[PDB]
Amino acid sequence: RLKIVTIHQEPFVYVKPTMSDGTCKEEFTVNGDPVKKVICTGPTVPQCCYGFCIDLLIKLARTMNFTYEVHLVADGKFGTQERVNKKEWNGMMGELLSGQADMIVAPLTINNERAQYIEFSKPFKYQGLTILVKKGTRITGINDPRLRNPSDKFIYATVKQSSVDIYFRRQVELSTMYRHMEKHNYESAAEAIQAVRDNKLHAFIWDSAVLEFEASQKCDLVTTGELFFRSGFGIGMRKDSPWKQNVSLSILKSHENGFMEDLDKTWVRY
C-alpha cells in the first residue's frame, strides 16, 4: 500500500472539503466524463483530491496492481536542500527521502539537484517557466529592465523552496534577480497569485502549466507568453523502488495512447 504525497496545485491537484458523510461529491466534466476523486488527509482532516495528477495516479494504480493512500505534504513545499554539517531536504523531497512517502505524485520538476537523490519517471508533462502579471502591468518578459535590475518599485518573486528558487539560486548570471527574489518569495503558488491580483506583487515567475491555466480563468491576470526555460514534471520515487521501471513505461504508453492528451484536454487547456 503505497503512501502517496502530493501538494495543492491547480489544475494538477484540486483539494476540496468532503461531504457530510465523509464521501466526495460526484461530478462530471462539461464534456460528460466522470471526475475521479480520492480521499486525501492533510494540514488534519480528510478532504477530496482530484485533477490531472490524480487521474494519472488512478491510471498508474490499475495498470501496475497497487493500492494507495494520499496525503498532502506537511510543510506545503515542493522541496529544496538546506543546511542543518549535514544537509536535509524540506518539502515532498524530504518526505520521500525519510520514508514518510513512497512516491511523489505532483507537478514535481525534474532537475539535477533532486535527481542526485531520487529516481524520476520519464516526464509525464513537458512545460516551462513564464511570468504571470496583472493585466495593466506590461513587461517584455524575462529581460525587461524592471527585472534585469530590480528595485522596490517593481516586486517580482517565486515560491520558496521550489525548483524555481533553486534555478535562480544556482546560476551566476541570475545573481541580482535572485537577491531581489529571496526577500519576496511566497510560501505557495496560490498566495503568490492572490498577491498579484491584490497588487502587492507585480510579477510571479512560475510553471507555465499552472500560470496559463490561472490566466485563462482569472482574466485580470495575463502571462507574457514566452517560456524562458523548459522543464518537465516527473513521478518521484526513492533510489531503490521496484516501481521505477514500470511507472515510466506506463507514462510512455500513456503519451502514445492519447491518454495524456485527454488529461491535457480535460484539465490543462482553455
Partner: protein, 280 residues
Amino acid sequence: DNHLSIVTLEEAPFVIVEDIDPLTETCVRNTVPCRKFVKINNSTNEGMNVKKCCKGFCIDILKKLSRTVKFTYDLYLVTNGKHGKKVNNVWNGMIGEVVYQRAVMAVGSLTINEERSEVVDFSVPFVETGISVMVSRGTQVTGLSDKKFQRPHDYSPPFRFGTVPNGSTERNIRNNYPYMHQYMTRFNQRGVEDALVSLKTGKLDAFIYDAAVLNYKAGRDEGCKLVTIGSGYIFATTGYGIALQKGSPWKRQIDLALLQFVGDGEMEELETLWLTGICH
C-alpha cells in the same frame, strides 16, 4: 574499459555526415571521426569500412558527455535500418545495434518510446519532440486531434494532409485514429523535403511529423511561410534520448550530466547553435 562502441545515424542538424577533409586524412574543426560500412553491391553482405566525419547537435552532446562522464568512444553509423523498428520481433536500426551488443549506446535523433524502452535503457530526454503539424501561414489547425483531421469529410473541401509513411508517425496515427490513417494514405509524401515543397506550392494543406524536425524546418524556411503549432498542442509528447544497453553502468552518470547541461544553460547554447533559425 571506459572505451565505448557507439552507433549514430545521419539526420541534419542532429548528425551531419561529411567526407573526410580533402584529404589530410583527418577530421577537422567541428567534427569527430565516424566510420561507415559501405556494401560492395546489394547481392552481398561484403563491404568496406569508410572513414567519415560527423558533426551536429547530437555530436556536440556526445562530446560534452565524453568529457564529463570521462569515456572514449569509437563512433560508427548504422547500416541497416534507421532509428529502430521491430521487424518480425527482430530490431534493425540504431536500437538493433544496441540490443544485439554491437554498440553500448546510441546517439542521434532517437525518440524515446515504450516498445524500445522494454529492450534498451534511455537517458533523460535532451530535446523535446512529439507529433506536430506544419501548415502555410494563414491555415487554422490546433493539432493532430483537430476534428478537421479526425473526420476529414465533415468539411468541404476536405483537407489534404499527410506524413512520410513507414515510420513512427504513421504507426502512431494508425493505432489512435484509424479513419484518419485510412484517409491520409492518398497523401503520403516520400520525404520531408518533398512534403515541404508540396506545402509551399499548394499541393498539400498540412504535413504531420516529428515536432523537433518540423520546428527546425520552419525556423529556416525561406520566406518564413511555414508554421507549426504551439508546443502545448504537440501530440504524444516525448523527447530524443540516448539509448544504452539494458542495465548499463553509464545510465546514472549520463542522466545526471544531461540534467546538468539543461539546468546550467549549456543545452540552450547548443540549441541556439544548431536548431534555432532565422524565422520567429
